[PDB]
């Protein structure tokens, strides 16, 4: 489970000289979203339903989705 931050709160933790920790969390938080996006589409949409369908069918990747 990933915590979600509102964009106004993210704006509060961006843009100004507050502490190191809020820069750390906005950076590591959007990186955590990026890494779970990579793991998530690595687990379900790429391998399980799409890419072996491309190697079986023959048509390229875009029109399958």
């Amino acid at each position: 489970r990933l915590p979600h931050f509102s964009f106004e709160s993210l704006t509060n933790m961006w843009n100004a000289k507050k502490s190191t920790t809020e820069l750390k969390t906005v950076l590591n938080y959007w990186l955590s979203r990026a890494q779970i996006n990579i793991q998530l589409l690595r687990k379900q949409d790429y391998i399980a339903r799409n890419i072996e369908q491309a190697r079986l069918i023959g048509i390229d990747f875009h029109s399958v989705y």
Partner: protein, 459 residues
């Protein structure tokens, strides 16, 4: 047996040569603390998201506090071959190869070895290996720097510790640890000696909290059977009564767990606490404080709960006597015997650091004894949920671990007994770690004759 023969042998004390309808009153106790001050830790009568503003308040308050001491109380810049020790805290100019006084606060490793909606154990995989490594990071809120050296593990400056570090720089990232800084001493509250007609003053920090679940009789045992009579009927013939003063519990008034308790089992243990306290109140006056597992705010400034610890027999005494024989005091309190100021802590404030939230800073009584030495020295944020109030948490007068220093700090509920004394440049401070009562008691006399403590094994 021959145990009875020992009583047969000891016929010298027929009645101890006491009248025994004469009570020999022992203590002329002063207790200057009770009436003519506000207690800072105590609540606000008008009062009767929070933590965030408090953390910057501690950081700024310490920042001007120790800003007065980087060259006044520490190293002259004429040394180090004129390496500049000027008061630059930010890491932008720490990268200058002259070592400055890096006034910052260590937040290197503080998370939990024991524990799922938020998926904690998957996050805790990062906790275990990285936290186990003892490496220390210093944060002035402008940037982390690496720390190595001998004092990494020997001196337990775990968290919230504003220090100025001195080492040969040799890299922008890291230092060694040769020196640390401290807050300035708020000054010597005068320790008196009443030299003319010395009272042989009372000497007590006895109870760490009579931890009393209804679920066990063994914790009920060693209270009301050996105690309440060591204060008055069980006799060291007769000097134990002369040493003993006014009763001091510290936290842990009734042990219970919050998710398993209801109304009437709370009053069962509270009325048996009332039995104990109304039993001992004719003999020895008492000062009572809640704060870890007895009912509380579960904070260091915690409102002490009157009128609930007592039955109707004992309820009318606090109405009758305002603060003399018993008063409700908080988890910290400055008990002052005309300037013998002593501080109390129920123990949770250091026990969470000592067992619950510690993956690092470890080179077990002689280790954990010095954690509250550290927490005394920096006067800092020990716990994980401090000051925990919806209205008026800290109004720039009342730090939970305060700024005025005592002569003895009381902390409680350790595995073993520990009692040393250390002298600092400000004052002298005796270390008091009174153990939890199910861990064999080790119940203690405190102070105030030649500033000396005496434990006794209650098991």
């Amino acid at each position: 047996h021959m145990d009875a023969l020992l009583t047969k042998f000891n016929e010298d004390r027929s009645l101890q040569d006491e009248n025994l309808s004469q009570p020999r009153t022992r203590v002329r106790i002063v207790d200057d603390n009770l009436y003519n001050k506000s207690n800072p830790f105590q609540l606000c009568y008008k009062k009767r998201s929070q933590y965030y503003h408090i953390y910057q308040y501690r950081l700024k308050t310490f920042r001007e506090r120790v800003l007065k001491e980087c060259d006044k109380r520490w190293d002259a810049g004429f040394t180090l071959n004129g390496q500049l020790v000027l008061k630059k805290d930010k890491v932008l100019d720490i990268q200058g190869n002259q070592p400055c006084w890096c006034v910052g606060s260590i937040y290197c490793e503080m998370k939990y070895k024991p524990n799922t909606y938020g998926a904690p154990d998957l996050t805790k995989s990062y906790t275990d290996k990285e936290g186990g490594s003892d490496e220390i990071m210093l944060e002035d809120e402008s940037g982390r720097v690496l720390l190595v050296g001998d004092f990494i593990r020997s001196t337990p400056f775990i968290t919230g510790v504003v220090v100025g570090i001195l080492g040969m720089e040799a890299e922008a990232g890291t230092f060694q640890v040769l020196d640390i800084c401290y807050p300035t001493p708020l000054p010597q509250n005068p320790f008196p000696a009443p030299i003319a007609t010395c009272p042989t003053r009372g000497k007590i920090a006895l109870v760490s909290g009579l931890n009393l679940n209804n679920t066990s009789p063994d914790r009920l045992l060693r209270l009301e059977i050996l105690r309440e009579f060591l204060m008055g009927r069980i006799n060291n013939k007769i000097d134990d009564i002369s040493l003993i003063g006014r009763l001091l519990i510290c936290g842990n008034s009734v042990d219970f767990d919050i998710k398993s308790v209801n109304k009437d089992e709370l009053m069962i243990s509270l009325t048996e606490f009332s039995k104990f306290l109304h039993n001992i109140l004719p003999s020895i006056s008492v000062d009572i404080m809640p704060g870890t597992n007895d009912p509380s705010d579960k904070s260091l400034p915690q409102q002490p709960f009157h009128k609930s610890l007592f039955d109707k027999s004992l309820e009318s005494y606090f109405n009758g006597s305002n603060k003399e024989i018993l008063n409700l005091v908080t988890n910290p309190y400055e008990f002052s015997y005309n300037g013998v100021d002593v501080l109390a802590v129920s123990g949770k404030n250091i026990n969470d650091i000592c067992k619950y939230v510690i993956p690092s800073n470890d080179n077990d009584i002689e280790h954990r004894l010095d954690l509250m030495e550290c927490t005394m020295k920096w006067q800092n944020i020990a716990p994980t949920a401090p000051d925990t109030l919806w209205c008026y948490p800290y109004t720039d007068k009342d730090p939970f671990v305060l700024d005025k220093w005592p002569h003895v700090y009381i902390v409680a509920n350790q595995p073993y007994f520990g009692t040393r004394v250390v002298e600092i440049g400000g004052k002298n401070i005796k270390i008091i770690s009174v153990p939890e009562f199910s861990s064999t008691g080790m119940i203690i006399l405190l102070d105030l004759e030649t500033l000396e403590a005496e434990t006794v094994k209650i098991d």
